Amino acid sequence: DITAIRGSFSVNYATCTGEVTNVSGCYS
Amino acid sequence: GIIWKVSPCAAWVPSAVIELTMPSGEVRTFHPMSGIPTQVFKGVSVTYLGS
């Protein structure tokens, strides 16, 4: 359960499509 | 001469290997002693203990 504490950051700041291609195999 | 360096920690605490990736794109590697509430200082953020 690694965690980190936050300081004074330097946080920075159109069309888009997903278009899936394939799927692999896992469950459990 | 043959020279040895020593340190008497005299304890054993779990630790992990951690890679950091600053959102600007910068990445920093470090070995934090996450078993203890250690505070590795780098850039702006600091991590600390784990489970």
Add this chain to the structure above:
Amino acid sequence: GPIICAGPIHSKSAGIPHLLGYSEKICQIDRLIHVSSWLRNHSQFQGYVGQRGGRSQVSYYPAENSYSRWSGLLSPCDADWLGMLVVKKAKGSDMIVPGPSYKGKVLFERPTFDGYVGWGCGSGKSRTESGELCSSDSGTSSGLLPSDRVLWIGDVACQPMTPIPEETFLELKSFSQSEFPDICKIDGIVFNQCEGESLPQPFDVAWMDVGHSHKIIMREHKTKWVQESSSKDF
């Protein structure tokens, strides 16, 4: 003591002129000649400053100043004659530091977030208290004073630069704000936008000017001392 020479003593009405020579004005800076010219330009008084004074007797508010011993280092008020930086007048919004005792003063410096501030009283308007009001008195008619009218706050070492990219300047200001979560407003200049505040606090941290408007402060900096043979430094 004296960088080149001991400043001449002339028994007062004399306007010391410009010298094109580089090694001639340094001992004049030793004489505090430039600060007298500041009076003639803004205070409008022909008071010769620092007879026998030089740089061997001038004292600053700090009890011990290592930089004062090394007179080779250049002072912010002395960088005005040489042309690197300039001191300006004082605004009504600008206020005094109650640190030192303003007894028999006419000109004292105060580096700020924006620039360097010099304050003036009248010749004969003796400064016998820390307040802004100057008081008339006949005891200061004589111009002889061991830097009594010239007290300088701060320990500042000046030197020429090579400027930095605007982006490099931007890194310091953002990181300085991160280093100071509690500091929000400084001298009225915004440092970080916060809520309502209390006004009175003397604030003293190390600072550095990189040729940009916003001053840069530090608490975990590592300085470096290197000297090289430069024709300007001769």
Add this chain to the structure above:
Amino acid sequence: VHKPGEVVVSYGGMRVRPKCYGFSRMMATMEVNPPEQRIGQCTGCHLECIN
């Protein structure tokens, strides 16, 4: 001249040259966060069976 030399300032991962590196006193101001905290709400309480 009797001087230490030029100053080079490195403050956390960069190298910066000073025009006039010095110390001085300024006026600052301090902010304060005043928080009034309290909660209270209605709840539903019932008994189905008691043993």
Add this chain to the structure above:
Amino acid sequence: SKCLKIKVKRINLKCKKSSSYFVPDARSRCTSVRRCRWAGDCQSGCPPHFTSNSFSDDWAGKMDRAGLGFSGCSDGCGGAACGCFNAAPSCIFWRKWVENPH
């Protein structure tokens, strides 16, 4: 006549506060002002005494954001490699800060 009632509510196993202390969060911060001889003019032998509170080398004496940090000189660089042209070694003063930002 009058009376007095005493109501009990719970039974538990506590113990009295014999002492009391607070524990902040320490971060080890350190600076280094790097003089060299004839430029800071420090002595050939490093002064065994150290004023851990004033530090007149950097702005005389004021508040140190560390709680009674230590002091000391360091080993020396000398030559054109470090630039101030003295073959003699150099003295370097160091700080140590314990800090609790948040």
